[PDB]
Curated annotation (Swiss-Prot):
UniProt short sequence motif Cell attachment site, positions renumbered to this chain: 50-52
GO cellular component term, pick one: extracellular region
Localization per record: Secreted
Organism, scientific name: Streptomyces avidinii
Main localization of the protein described in the UniProt heading: secreted
Name this polypeptide is given: Streptavidin
Functional note: The biological function of streptavidin is not known. Forms a strong non-covalent specific complex with biotin (one molecule of biotin per subunit of streptavidin).
Isomerase among keywords: no
Family to which this protein belongs: Belongs to the avidin/streptavidin family.
């Protein structure tokens, strides 16, 4: 079965109450911070990612992804999440993602290292 720069930049909110603050660069960079409303997390965490900086103009969304490692000055959950999805522009803009969250585990426990979920981001709370 296998601009965005202007549209992605700013603050987004997911269905869990988490907050994403991101700047999209002209050549595909995403940089910013993330504050999770759930899990072993407090305060903001560094976020970095990439997006398609020259997406198709045929009605398709804009592919992107980013990562947060859940370590900051306050806590370290020994885990990292990566969101993969697309930005869909317009009056009801969305970033629709699926997200993998991997914890450091022993080798014996590796089969239960990684969650899969889905987060939908909107520009209004
Ligand atoms: C991926 C989910 N979407 C989200 O906004 N936060 C969740 C992840 C929280 C993980 C916090 C660190 C931990 O508990 O391991
Ligand atoms: Na694993
Ligand atoms: Ni956790």
């Amino acid at each position: 079965h296998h601009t965005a720069e202007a549209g992605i930049t700013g603050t987004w909110y997911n269905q869990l109450g988490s907050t994403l603050i991101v700047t999209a660069g002209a050549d595909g960079a995403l940089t910013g911070t993330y504050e999770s409303a759930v899990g072993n997390a407090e305060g903001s965490y560094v976020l970095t990612g990439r997006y398609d900086s020259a997406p198709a103009t045929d009605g398709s969304g804009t592919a992107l992804g980013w990562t947060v490692a859940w370590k900051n000055n306050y806590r370290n959950a020994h885990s990292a999440s990566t969101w993969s999805g697309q930005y869909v522009g317009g009056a009801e803009a969305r970033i629709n993602t699926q997200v993998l969250t991997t914890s450091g585990t022993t080798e014996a426990n590796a089969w239960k290292s990684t969650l899969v979920g889905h987060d939908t981001f909107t520009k209004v709370k």
